[PDB]
Ligand binder design. Sequence first.
Ligand SMILES: Cc1cc2nc3c(=O)[nH]c(=O)nc-3n(C[C@H](O)[C@H](O)[C@H](O)COP(=O)(O)OP(=O)(O)OC[C@H]3O[C@@H](n4cnc5c(N)ncnc54)[C@H](O)[C@@H]3O)c2cc1C
Ligand code: SF4
Ligand code: SF4
Ligand code: SF4
Ligand code: SF4
Ligand code: SF4
Ligand code: SF4
Ligand code: FES
Ligand code: FES
Lengths: 1172, 98
Amino acid sequence: MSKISININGRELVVSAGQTILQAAAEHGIEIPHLCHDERIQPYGACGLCVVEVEGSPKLVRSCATSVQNGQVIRTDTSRTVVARKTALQLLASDHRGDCRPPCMLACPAQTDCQGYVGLIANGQYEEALKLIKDKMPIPASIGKICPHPCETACRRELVEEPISIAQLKSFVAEVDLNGNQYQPPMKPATGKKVAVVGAGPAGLTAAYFLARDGHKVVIYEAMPHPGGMLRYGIPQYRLDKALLDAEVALMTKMGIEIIYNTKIGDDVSLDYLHDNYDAVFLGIGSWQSQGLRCKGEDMEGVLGGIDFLREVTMNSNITLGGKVLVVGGGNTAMDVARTSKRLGAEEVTIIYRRTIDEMPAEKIEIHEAQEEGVKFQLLVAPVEVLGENGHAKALKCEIMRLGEPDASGRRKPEPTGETVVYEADRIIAAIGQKTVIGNIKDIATDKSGNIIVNGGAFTTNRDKVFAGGDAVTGPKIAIDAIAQGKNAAQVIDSYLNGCLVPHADSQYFTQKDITAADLADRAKAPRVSLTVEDAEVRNKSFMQVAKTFTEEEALRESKRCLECGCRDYFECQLIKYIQDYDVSTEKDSQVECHKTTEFDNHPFIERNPDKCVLCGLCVRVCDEVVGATAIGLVGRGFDSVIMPEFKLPLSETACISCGQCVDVCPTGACMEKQVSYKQIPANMDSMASVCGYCGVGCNVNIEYKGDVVFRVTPDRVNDDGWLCQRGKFGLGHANDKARLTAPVIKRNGQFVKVDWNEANLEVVKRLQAVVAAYGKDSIGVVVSPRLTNEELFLAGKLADAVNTTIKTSYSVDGGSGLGSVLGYDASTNSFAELDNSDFVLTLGKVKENHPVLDFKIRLSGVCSVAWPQSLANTADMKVFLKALLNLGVDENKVAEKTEGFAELKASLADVKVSEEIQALAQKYAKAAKPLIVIDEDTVSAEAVKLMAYAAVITGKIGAAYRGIILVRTKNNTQGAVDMGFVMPVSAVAQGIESGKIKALVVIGEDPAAYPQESALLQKLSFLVVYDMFMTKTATAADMVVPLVSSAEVNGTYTRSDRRIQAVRAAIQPKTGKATLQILIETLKSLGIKYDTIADVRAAIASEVSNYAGMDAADFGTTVYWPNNKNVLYTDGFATEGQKAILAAVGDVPVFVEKKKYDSVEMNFVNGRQSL
Amino acid sequence: MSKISININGRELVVSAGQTILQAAAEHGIEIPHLCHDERIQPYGACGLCVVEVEGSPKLVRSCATSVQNGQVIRTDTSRTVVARKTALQLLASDHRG
Ligand SMILES: Cc1cc2nc3c(=O)[nH]c(=O)nc-3n(C[C@H](O)[C@H](O)[C@H](O)COP(=O)(O)OP(=O)(O)OC[C@H]3O[C@@H](n4cnc5c(N)ncnc54)[C@H](O)[C@@H]3O)c2cc1C
Ligand code: SF4
Ligand code: SF4
Ligand code: SF4
Ligand code: SF4
Ligand code: SF4
Ligand code: SF4
Ligand code: FES
Ligand code: FES
């Protein structure tokens, strides 16, 4: 039928009927904007960004709410749709208030993400901080050491106290990585293009770095014996250590960049040579000519430039200074020359300038350091005449000025006074400024000041294939400007090499400019970290460093003080994405009203900001139509429309479940989830696909992390439905806990002593062997938790077998659900995927409260779901239900053939009367063609499960598709623990403890000792081992504790409630050193069973466990079910001894007794809920 | 369509409406014999090796010439289909020379 073939945007597509055009274009990779669209709920039609032009319809049709037909023509980028989307986005931006990026990053010329790496330092991830920094420059330590930090001026912490020392943190992290493992960023595969870079300054080095990172081959031609440019030959040693720069350039050279020294372009190698032999040329020559005194007698011997003097100082040449030195100028050159001459044996140095101290262009810190060192300032003075004798200059004549009106740049103009003064000197150094010289390079256009003329935004000179940047274009400026220009020019050159030149253009962000000190009166005040500066005694005579780098403690203390000004949703916000894509300006107005809120919702998990809302309605639609709590709703009309909780109450006082679906469907930053880490940040986080470790539903999750810290959890919308509950969303926060154990401890004299892993292994094996020797067989019980993977449970069973015991148990499993004795397998007879096609679902227990994602799925399915009444708590009512089902005409012959003991059961129910409600429920179950039963194991006794199985068996609604019993378990791998044999009841363990038969216990991940009776039972032991993550109540009373890792650091598999085996992948490396599987493998190697890796364990599981045959090549990335990869159990008969269902009479039953929680993680979550 | 989804041979499959059960089983890697079937032309119904057992229908249905519906249970290796295919292949082999 050429499956519904359509034509969109000129292309021909094959799609499926009943879809939406938006879904089809997403399937075939065509981008159509949308904000209020979600495929799992009904269309809303609010934004209007998804309008497309369909031939035959005079008006625009929304692609989110129209069905694909055969042979329709669609256009998504016509002028009408473009202007409609532009208008909608302009109207949306007229009410949106926020900071897309913090002021500190926007003030930096290179746009380095200061908030991101400051926050990453505050979380203790230094390598990730350097990975953030090195996306914008290749030399972070030097730049952090010398930058005048314009970013630090714009920091909003200035509104409270001194701002964050951003540059010192950058230098600290760069030095910590240089002393440790040097980072090399990944490179694209080689493209074969050749780029020649003239000059190895910051601009040239940055261009070469960012061009070699794109696969090209870069060669640097340098006119000096060492690389660095004015960072080497202009910055003195006591401010920037040259060894640091040499090490950084060596790191860059290790990437494959060839630097050719002693080669001057124009004098030694012509530029035509580079033009002919290379695919691109980038000129980063910089400004290297000293301005003269611009006065009479400036050519006299004894007057030298500041730049040449500094270069001669750097090359360790022979210089002459004499006693008295006069430096003319006020920039950074004058300061550096003055202090260098002070360190070079000059007894007195004088600085001469024309404006006030307050109008010096140098930094105030450098001026104060120079004043402390001993250089005297001579003020309000300009050059007049240089007086000398016999070709030697000894005096400088000058005029005295006076203060005048401020200029347009904010500095007071000097005015002459007519007073002359002469100054004695032995050397005069002119440090007025630098000027660009082009040298012998020809056919390059230059401006009136000597700078290279380039096309703005494209960095192209008059000559083709030749580019320029840095001080050659902007004149003398700070180093970060040169780095930014080099990076932008590298991007432009890379685009040019691909055949299409695109100019560099800035981006649009939302910014807020009304923040004042009165808005930050609730913040605490913390003093800034002072810098340790060497005393003025040693500074005046030596060239060593005057300041020391931050220590780790100081860096943490400084970094934990940021305010997090930026938006946390920036890297996933769609409003800003469409604003950048559709060229919409974010500048505000004054008359238009953006309503500013004074909201206060201190919910511990959910954050709502009404200012960033776009009224897409996804959050309220999800919370009503899926979750069903309806904790939020719309209030008002028009501009007063706002989404807010029930009766304007706080979200904590309403029916909210903190599931986080409203957070996960929001397209902007209005709804946000709270922070799992120590200090959360806006960042591009790595994602790992795993499954939830709390319930038997086993929802797939994506763990978003940065380094060794997990930051958030999101649903997996591709492989599952994409729903989560509070435990899945906010439950991985124990992986970052600082109270986790790190090394095993052995008790001696009543105190725990830290031991090595080998000593721990020896101690546990020898003590277990001693217990076995002293008390014989069956003296050891193995108590495990159902949270462990399949391989760890199999290895624990192997350890139980090899230690000569049969007591393997769990407090959570506590003997299983009782369905095993009737049908043969203690497992669900149907999968979750069959809840969609059933026509009746009967729920037993609190399925909604305990496993809520299953309730979401049942509600979205729309099938008729009837809950078992609460006023029927005893099983006499279930016996009445059985009698009512029997009276409705069941086939007795088939149930006589396929079951054992049907006649006795029928005789037992002979005198049972039937009530009306029971009759109605029985009728509803009887007329249903394909009825399912969903039983919550947390709130239903085993005998009720047996009676429900009897009801399903006698009606013949079991053993086939879309009919049976679905049983949801308490924990993630309760089914796996059942399938490995951990099905012994706990009462046997208690009795064996109190009868003296059991002398030792091995507890893996459980906390039985939190209750007084079990603690009293454990106190009568002889040797107890606890494997746990935390020093719980049980581990305190043990004789030996071994740490465990969390579910974010383990590789393995989990068996779902419906017998589905899902792979669990490790996001971060084990913080204790060894995984649980490794610990069990070494213990079994000590006991004499040899396993190497997880493949051997999986092969052993396949070859020893009966129903997991095929796990060796199972490919757990797809759907794997353990009974012969079948969704339905008992298709060819039950799995009992005689292939018949075993029906046995059950007695009178009291009200259900609520079960307890024994897994340490699941009680830690409950206790940590109360902390906020 | 929400999800046209079927259950064949115990497994749960997601399919597309308007197809044949033979095409769906080939899509999901389930082997059903066929000799006179081609997806690009009309069904013929000659060999009979494509018969499957569908719940609700008392007689065998040919998977090459039936449309896939929602929530149907299909068995392709029951004893009746096995003996039918064995008989058909025994009758075919009674005239084949080579
Ligand atoms: C006294 C002084 C104080 C300073 N203080 C600061 C400060 O506080 N903060 C700060 O951030 N920066 C400071 N700087 C540095 C300066 O502000 C910038 O770092 C400057 O922009 C360096 O970048 P650039 O691109 O110009 O590189 P350059 O340093 O100009 O690099 C040019 C390179 O190309 C080479 N070259 C030149 N001509 C040719 C040719 N024809 N062929 C081949 N190679 C050639 C040069 O030898 C050099 O290696 C200071 C500099 C000086 C001199
Ligand atoms: S380079 Fe300068 S402006 Fe940029 S982050 Fe570092 S200190 Fe701030
Ligand atoms: S407080 Fe932090 S986020 Fe805000 S401007 Fe300062 S460094 Fe940037
Ligand atoms: S929600 Fe989006 S548009 Fe609004 S401030 Fe955050 S990043 Fe910017
Ligand atoms: S967290 Fe869940 S229940 Fe609470 S408001 Fe959001 S969607 Fe509704
Ligand atoms: S809070 Fe978020 S999801 Fe809800 S209407 Fe506003 S933008 Fe949409
Ligand atoms: S329902 Fe259970 S398995 Fe699913 S996310 Fe919640 S706690 Fe995890
Ligand atoms: S109107 Fe369709 S995406 Fe909003
Ligand atoms: S394949 Fe021949 S009858 Fe269907």
